[PDB]
Write a protein that binds this ligand. Structure first.
Ligand SMILES: CC(C)C[C@H](N)P(=O)(O)O
Ligand SMILES: CC(C)C[C@H](N)P(=O)(O)O
Ligand SMILES: CC(C)C[C@H](N)P(=O)(O)O
Ligand SMILES: [Zn+2]
Ligand SMILES: [Zn+2]
Ligand SMILES: [Zn+2]
Ligand SMILES: [Zn+2]
Ligand SMILES: [Zn+2]
Ligand SMILES: [Zn+2]
Ligand SMILES: [Zn+2]
Ligand SMILES: [Zn+2]
Lengths: 484, 161, 484
């Protein structure tokens, strides 16, 4: 059997009744007015994101779910910094597909709702669930475009959504399965599948040692799980020598805190401490699928942070790749330790731009929660490009300060050049960003602290409860526009 | 509007609800409030800058420009429905005085204040992080800082011109 | 708009299709089989507690909600200690009514589902919501029996559920509105509206002093809110001299802990620390409405527990009505202090039984959670009557021990006859019960610790999130059976 999802807008002042989309009106005509008749009989009008199901309207569609789309001409909301119409579509289509799945229907056709890309994003992101390890699972639903006119846009939405879902899968998978080695292998197969214009280097411990990445090595040694430095290349520019854009992601497969051990409550979520690596690697995979005309390099140091007889000890001093010494006052501030080495290495590619992503601080969550990813950057041009891209995707970004005020608090160090924790407890996300900056000399660098957007309860309507994979689509959109 | 007082220590937003309401009676050009509102703001930006939540980009820009001159910096924070949703989700009343989660404490606090404002040019300054000075601002000895008084004066001077 | 809720059972092995209730098949017959046809078209069968909505089947009922009732012959489940058939009905009907309300339909007729009392209970308990203090409220729904054959049973369910809902209202209302005086006045009006064979005395502080209730007074003094001792009489026996059954309830309108102050997190729930008073008083109101042929007395000491310059201080020694001295080591163990005096006063009525209820210990919540009310009793006959009544109502009880082992830990006291907290944290609910026992000489006494069933999230399907009003119905059932 097959289900159908159709949209209807909120009634405008001059209108006599709420208007269906082109597809909704076509279906109504196909069934001689039965859809409009039954909707009228059912009562109150459908508002944005709400749904209602009608059965037996047509032999080929035993279940038809009508979804509220809100105001038809809703565009960019200057107060919310996003295209509202697209967000309305994503939420409504997701709700509609979930209803069809609850009815145990394996196939669903989806109304493009005036924006096939947004519709596809709502369907593909909305239906996603990581259930590989469960015996009892919901019915697998195959979603397809209702009609054929907007197929290119629909396919684009499926692509953007699939990129985010790959990030979600990587983040959600338990750490005993999603090890540094496994992560690298999954990224490898996906990237090669995306394009032949790629190269993958799963660098072992011996290479990490040759590169003198002492900061990264200090974090990894506490665990028995082998660390790896994942390096991927996408050669999309017509000019092979064109300087690449470099992406860096924090890849802590599991963060227990080490000797400065974490509290037990909700520590399970630390399996997603490799979200920075997941989002940048998935964005690169998607950019390759899109065949973007640009050169890109992705860097992801991966390891676990565990307590043992050989783990990092508070007060220990380690030497980063650039020769700068770091006093490890708290072993649980490990993300900045591994990133110091990756950021140094990023400069060897003589990049056009350097962008890193990391589930870096709990302070970022206290600051903005899941409302937006915090962006620290020394380039207002770069900030604006990321901001503009986020308006389109709905996966918002918000700027945070990169001031010397914060640097002063990390370079005040008893034993070394820089301390891995600030002198005071205030502004944790800002002092962490300042630390990273001590390992960057590039004029166009941006640091994304995604700790607050690591998970979703129900804030983003179209994502079920679990790891969010944010802000993957914003990175893909940034890359697309940059290439144009 | 009814308010459910789940935590008696989230008192600043309770007294501000009534003051903001009264502010509308003057048919003002702009409404600007300042408060040592949340510990969350301190965790967010510390003493680096005062957090500003506003529904007017014109107003944000005037405050920002004034801060460049005085050196007593301001930094914009979001006013999104995302945060409002977490304070209007209330068991007994119209609005709850604490959010359903600890995340984004300064933002949910701002969202609470917004439920008592209908004016088109309103700005809320959370100065909790700049309440004191240790050694951050070189020209202020250790103690209460009195920030961002000069930025407000500069804003008024420029506005009057 | 007029809605209809109909039930369908799970299919048995030798049946060709799942069977509707009598009302369901009657409606199906009326519409020439269209209900069965559309249900079949909609897909998978409806399991216990699930619902599906069909529109436009009949002019009088634009919206028909079918609900799954589970196995038709489901009786007493020996493993769960309840009548499963009744629990299935309460859950299914509540679910169906919630859907009708979401559709903003003001009136609904409900299938009796083979047990009109259970159906009415699901509808009335399920629709309840405390929204007096909100500007935005759901549509008020008027639920009534579908048909005219089971009127008495339906109304009995409405009565039992209404008793529980009064308890829920009293518990949910904020403490600044629900003061000792307000609680007493609300109970007074409800009891008088229930029967003219009632007497109510809202005893003032001066009476409490005359009665030498020093333990109760010590708790009350910290607050500015005046305390009262509520005493209610229901004269239902044909014989005026027939000894009464006595109910006692803990009435702390708000518990801050006093000098031994509570932590901030979720302290708002302490507005329900008068739940014991709420449940026992509501049960009596319902017994009066039913005109049960028995004499009943209700007693409820009411006050706030607040910190101030005149509040109870740890180490203080107070004297109970019976002359026993109590060492107040922790001011937050206040429930047992006010109950000591109320239990003493209960003996003056030469009662047949003494039953008290109280949101007494966090330990009880750690012990059984919301699964069942803990019952400590010196009478196996009394335990069995409460147990049997709970099987019928579904609002379960579970026996807890009254052993000297626990008494020993509370009479071991540095300054007085008994200490208000045990010498250890182990068995908190049991030592609390042992403390109460030192103020009871009656042969048929039962103490109900309802702390664990104070609230509902999703455990009891037919109760929305909030204060639960449990186990009001179990007390009413006990009284009904006792009177027969
Ligand atoms: C909550 C989470 C974002 C904490 C980081 N993993 P940290 O322990 O490295 O700061
Ligand atoms: C630290 C300080 C700014 C807290 C506020 N006075 P609150 O207790 O009202 O949040
Ligand atoms: C959680 C709750 C039931 C605790 C009691 N009110 P107590 O503080 O009197 O033990
Ligand atoms: Zn993972
Ligand atoms: Zn850590
Ligand atoms: Zn980490
Ligand atoms: Zn406070
Ligand atoms: Zn304050
Ligand atoms: Zn109450
Ligand atoms: Zn207490
Ligand atoms: Zn108490």
């Amino acid at each position: 059997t097959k289900g159908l999802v159709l949209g209807i807008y909120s009634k405008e002042k001059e209108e006599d009744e709420p208007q269906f989309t082109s597809a909704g009106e076509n279906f109504n005509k196909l069934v001689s007015g039965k859809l409009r008749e039954i909707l009228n009989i059912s009562g109150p009008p459908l508002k944005a994101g709400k749904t209602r199901t009608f059965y037996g309207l047509h032999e080929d569609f035993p279940s038809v779910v009508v979804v509220g789309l809100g105001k038809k001409t809703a565009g960019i909301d200057e107060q919310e910094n996003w295209h509202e119409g697209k967000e309305n579509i994503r939420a409504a289509v997701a709700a509609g597909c979930r209803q069809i799945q609850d009815l145990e229907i394996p196939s669903v056709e989806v109304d493009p709702c005036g924006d096939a890309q947004a519709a596809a994003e709502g369907a593909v992101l909305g239906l996603y669930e990581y259930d590989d390890l469960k015996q009892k699972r919901k019915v697998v639903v195959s979603a397809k475009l209702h009609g054929s006119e907007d197929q290119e846009a629909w396919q684009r939405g499926v692509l953007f959504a699939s990129g985010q879902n790959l990030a979600r899968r990587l983040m959600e998978t338990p750490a005993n399965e999603m090890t540094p080695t496994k992560f690298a292998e999954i990224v490898e197969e996906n990237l090669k599948s995306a394009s032949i214009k790629t190269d993958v280097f799963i660098r072992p411990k011996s290479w990490i040692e040759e590169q003198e990445m002492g900061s990264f090595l200090s974090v990894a040694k506490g665990s028995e799980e082998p660390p790896v430095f994942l390096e991927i290349h996408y050669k999309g520019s017509p000019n092979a020598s064109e300087p690449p854009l470099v992406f860096v992601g924090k890849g802590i497969t599991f963060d227990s805190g080490g000797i400065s051990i974490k509290a037990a409550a909700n520590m399970d979520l630390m399996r997603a401490d490799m979200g920075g690596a997941a989002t940048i690697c998935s964005a690169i995979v998607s950019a390759a699928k899109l065949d973007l005309p640009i050169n890109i390099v992705g860097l992801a140091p991966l390891c676990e942070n565990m307590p043992s007889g050989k783990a990092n000890k508070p007060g220990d001093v380690v030497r980063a790749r650039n020769g700068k010494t770091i006093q490890v006052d708290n072993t649980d501030a490990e993300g900045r330790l591994i990133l110091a080495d990756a950021l140094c290495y990023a400069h060897t590619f003589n990049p056009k731009v350097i962008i890193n992503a990391a589930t870096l601080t709990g302070a970022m969550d206290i600051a903005l929660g899941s409302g937006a990813t915090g962006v620290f950057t020394n380039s207002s041009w770069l900030w604006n490009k990321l901001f503009e891209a986020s308006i389109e995707t709905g996966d918002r970004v918000w700027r945070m300060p990169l001031f010397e005020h914060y640097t002063r608090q990390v370079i005040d160090c008893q034993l070394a050049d820089v301390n891995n924790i600030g002198k005071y407890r205030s502004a944790g996300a800002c002092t962490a960003a300042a630390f990273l900056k001590e390992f960057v000399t590039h004029p166009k660098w941006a640091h994304l602290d995604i700790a607050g957007v690591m998970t979703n309860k129900d804030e983003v309507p179209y994502l079920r409860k679990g790891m969010a994979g944010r802000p993957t689509r914003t990175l893909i959109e940034f890359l697309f526009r940059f290439s144009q």
